Amino acid sequence: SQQVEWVFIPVIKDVTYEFKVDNNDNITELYVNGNKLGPASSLEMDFYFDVDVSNNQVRKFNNVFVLFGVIATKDSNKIKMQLTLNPCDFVRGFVFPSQDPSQLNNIFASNNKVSVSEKAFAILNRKKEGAVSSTINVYITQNTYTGNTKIEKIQQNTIIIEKNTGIVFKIPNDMLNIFRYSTT
Amino acid sequence: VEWVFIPVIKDVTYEFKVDNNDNITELYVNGNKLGPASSLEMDFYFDVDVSNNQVRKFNNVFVLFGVIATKDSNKIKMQLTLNPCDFVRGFVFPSQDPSQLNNIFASNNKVSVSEKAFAILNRKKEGAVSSTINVYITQNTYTGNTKIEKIQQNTIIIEKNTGIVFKIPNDMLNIFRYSTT
Numbered sequence A: 001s002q003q004v005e006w007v008f009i010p011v012i013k014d015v016t017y018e019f020k021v022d023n024n025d026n027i028t029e030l031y032v033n034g035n036k037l038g039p040a041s042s043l044e045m046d047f048y049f050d051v052d053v054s055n056n057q058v059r060k061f062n063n064v065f066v067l068f069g070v071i072a073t074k075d076s077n078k079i080k081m082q083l084t085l086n087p088c089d090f091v092r093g094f095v096f097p098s099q100d101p102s103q104l105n106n107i108f109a110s111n112n113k114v115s116v117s118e119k120a121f122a123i124l125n126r127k128k129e130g131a132v133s134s135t136i137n138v139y140i141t142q143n144t145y146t147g148n149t150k151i152e153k154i155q156q157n158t159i160i161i162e163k164n165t166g167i168v169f170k171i172p173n174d175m176l177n178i179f180r181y182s183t184t
Numbered sequence B: 001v002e003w004v005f006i007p008v009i010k011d012v013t014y015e016f017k018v019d020n021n022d023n024i025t026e027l028y029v030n031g032n033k034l035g036p037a038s039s040l041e042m043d044f045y046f047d048v049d050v051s052n053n054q055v056r057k058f059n060n061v062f063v064l065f066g067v068i069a070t071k072d073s074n075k076i077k078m079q080l081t082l083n084p085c086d087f088v089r090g091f092v093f094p095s096q097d098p099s100q101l102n103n104i105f106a107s108n109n110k111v112s113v114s115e116k117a118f119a120i121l122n123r124k125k126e127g128a129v130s131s132t133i134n135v136y137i138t139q140n141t142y143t144g145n146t147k148i149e150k151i152q153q154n155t156i157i158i159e160k161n162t163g164i165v166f167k168i169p170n171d172m173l174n175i176f177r178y179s180t181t
Helices: A101-106 A173-179 B098-102 B170-175
Strands: A006-010 A017-021 A027-032 A035-037 A049-052 A057-061 A064-068 A070-075 A078-083 A090-097 A113-117 A122-124 A135-139 A150-152 A159-163 A181-183 B004-007 B014-018 B024-029 B032-034 B046-049 B054-058 B061-065 B067-072 B075-080 B087-093 B110-114 B119-121 B132-136 B147-150 B156-160 B177-180
Touching: A006 A078, A035 A101, A057 A173, A070 A090, A078 A135, A090 A173, B004 B075, B032 B098, B054 B170, B067 B087, B075 B132
Parallel strands: A006 A135, A017 A159, A070 A181, B004 B132, B014 B156, B067 B177
Antiparallel strands: A006 A090, A017 A027, A027 A035, A049 A057, A064 A090, A064 A122, A070 A078, A090 A181, A113 A135, A150 A181, B004 B087, B014 B024, B024 B032, B046 B054, B061 B087, B061 B119, B067 B075, B087 B177, B110 B132, B147 B177
């Protein structure tokens, strides 16, 4: 599973992230703005979310990756990330083991990707993260951003976790505050 | 004039020529001449104790995070790591002159970086620097392990027009450290 491409997926405003969870509590698909991303490895739901199954609620997000010196924006229907090298800039998100990387081109504004050491990222609420590869693919444009940046928050229903039963896990609104990021 | 970032690293030589007016007339990096595109006061880079002919401190030491530096052939090679614990320290210098800079850096590839992205140690009369800085960085990231390295005696030479060389005590040089492979 460490021989698979793991990719960084920024969680940003006006993009919807839908995780499909099966009867075994495994993630079968991630849809980013409706674009399907299949997992290469069997992928436990608890790699991303700690769920209180009894009242159908997310307790916390696990393995939230933070990359510094970059900003993110929405460009057309795609995620655009740019290098600033300013340590006060950051973009937060998930890592995902792509079964079929060619699916990633619909999600990101650039074809341009670089490998970044896994040690470069801060990882919040680390849990059973040994599966992740030692380098992470990051989709970043070739053009630096040198203008002013600001911190933005995501919207209430940015992340949706859909079980096979049709029932969604509740995510409290305050929990989304962990996904703040730098943008233009 | 867009200013350029110059990493100060171990087996590269840096020689500053200072005139009788205490202005820098040239910087030689590994023997490659770099002419200043504006008038450039010596005290932008160094403060000097006239009484014992010694450097007191280095000024305007710029720090770029998420990058490493190495010596490749006779040139400075900088690479992106995006690891905030990685950094490269150095000078900024006013030249836009691609000829002179191509002899110094391993890559032709440069990007503009906001001046606000850098930390500046011992900042002094730094208002002349442009709002973006040219950084010569290769197109290929480095994902291996890194370590912090220091420079040595005789890495930096400061030479007055008279032939006299300013003493730099070894402890002063500790301000120049950087992440490398």
